[PDB]
Each structure stands twice: as structure tokens, then as C-alpha cells.
Amino acid sequence: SMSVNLTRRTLDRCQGNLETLQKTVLRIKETDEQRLRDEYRRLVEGLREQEAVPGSIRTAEHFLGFLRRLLEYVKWRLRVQHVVQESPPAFLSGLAQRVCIQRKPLRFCAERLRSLLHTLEITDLADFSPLTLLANFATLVSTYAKGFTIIIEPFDDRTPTIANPILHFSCMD
Amino acid sequence: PTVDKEVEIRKKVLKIYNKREEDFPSLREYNDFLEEVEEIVFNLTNNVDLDNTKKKMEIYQKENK
Ligand SMILES: [Cl-]
């Protein structure tokens, strides 16, 4: 659900996954670049399944480099000798400081990974369950970093002559 | 290239290409800028088209002093 556990061994399997993906992308660059251009066109100007994919993770290779920097940050953080607890904003602040990853592209990580796996036509999906777990972590920690808030508006702007107050429960405050 | 090399190259580039989302009048222009930054980092990291890339960085840095 909204919980994710990442073990050191899981991250080792993610590193294996990224190795595989990188070799596949190099092969496709040598054999069939059109598939990559088609994915790019879909991401920047076409069908997805709101906000545009951030320009830092549009191409397959830029996104793979992004995932390597994320993985390396997370591996670094796990070299503790005692329990550590911190807020999502502190984790993201360390991420930005150490490997230059910002919160917004993190939001897109799971979808971008699903697109990349579909584009490389990788048939088996369980093969990449560790990397997907990392992508999910990236999305959850970025999306829900500031927790939730309740906003009560005394009336709806659409119908300003009636008393139709609105309660909003959502992220980002 | 190691990830450590990629990161140091990226930090150097971002010291020059240091604009944030609120520095662009439109999201489209911001995202194009982000993709341009990726192209520069990739070139410097993989030693590709180095002269034209560092030429580009010098021009950008002069225009954004
Ligand atoms: Cl954001």
C-alpha cells in the first residue's frame, strides 16, 4: 500500500536491474533507435497512463542515470550502525544535496519506469520487481512528503450566492 | 564513468545552469531547460562533442552573468 521496505539485498538486486536495463538501451541504440524516439514522443506529446513529465527524465538514458544516482544515495543512507528516523523532507533534502535529485522528478518515477519497461518490451515483469519497488518508494516519498491537510472554504466559488462550503482533504500542506 | 564522477560533473554544470522553475515564464521552457542540462552533463560525462558543449556552456554563462 503506502508502505515500502527496502533492504540492502533488495537494492543490490536493483543495481542488477539497472545494469540489465542499461545494456538493453545500448543494444537498442545500436539496433532500433526508433523505439526510443517513439517513447519520447509519447511522453512529451501524447498518450500516457495532468503535469508534463519533467525534462530531467524524458529520455531513457537520462532516466537511468537518475535512477543510478537515487540508488547510490539510498545505499549510502543504509550504511548506518544504529537506527535512524527522519522526516521525508529531510530525506529529500539530503537527496538534493548529495546527488542533485529534486522532489518533482521523483513524483514521476513509477510511471516513467513503467513506460521504460513497456518500451524495451521486457516481457517478464517480476524480473524487475526490486527496481519497481525503488521507483514506488521514490514516488511515495516525493508525493506525500509534507503529509496531509484540511482546508475548509466557506462557500463554493462556482455558486457564490448559496452556502455550499467545501472541505478539502489533500497533500502539500 | 562512475556515479561519483557523474555527480561531480553535474554539480559543476548546475553551478552555471542554476535557474529554478520560477525563473521561466512557462513550464514548457523550464522542462526544455532541464533537458538541455541533461544533454550537457551527458556530454561532459561520456566525453562526447566536448568542444561544442563547452562552447555552449561559455555562451550560456556569458548570457547569464
Ligand atoms: Cl514538487
**B chain contacts of residue A72, beta-carbon cutoff 8 Å:** 3
Alpha carbon distance B13, B26 (integer Å): 22
All cell numbers assigned to A78: 543504509
Residue in A115, A145, A144, A132 with CA at minimum distance from that of residue A53? A115
**A chain contacts of residue B43, beta-carbon cutoff 8 Å:** none
Output b/e per residue, A147-156; b: 16+ Cβ within 10 A: eeeeeeeeee
Q: What are the boundaries of each domain within chain B?
A: 3-63
All cell numbers assigned to B64: 547569464
Concatenated DSSP letters of A130-150: HHHHHHHHHHHHHHTTT--EE
Residue in B65, B43, B38 with CA at minimum distance from that of residue B54? B43
Instruction: Find residue A149's DSSP bridge partners.
Output: A170
CB A21 within 8 A of CB A114: no
Amino acid at B63: E
Interchain CB contact of B3 with A (< 8 Å): yes
Task: Measure in Å the smallest separation between the Cα of B63 and chain A Cα atoms.
Answer: 22
CB A59 within 8 A of CB A40: yes
Interchain CB contact of B16 with A (< 8 Å): no
All cell numbers assigned to A161: 450566492
Instruction: Find residue A151's DSSP bridge partners.
Output: A168
**A chain contacts of residue B41, beta-carbon cutoff 8 Å:** 65
User: To which residue does cell 463554493 refer?
Assistant: A156
User: To which residue does cell 509534507 refer?
Assistant: A146
Concatenated DSSP letters of B3-62: HHHHHHHHHHHHHHS---GGGSSSHHHHHHHHHHHHHHHHHHHTT-SHHHHHHHHHHHHH
**Other C-beta atoms lying within 10 Å of the C-beta of residue A9:** 9
Using only the alpha carbons of chain B, give its radius of gyration: 12
Give the Cα-Cα-Cα angle A83, A89, A92 (nearest 5 degrees). Answer: 85
Alpha carbon distance A111, A98 (integer Å): 24
Q: Which residues lie closer than 8 Å to A144 by C-beta, 6 or more apart?
A: A2, A88, A171
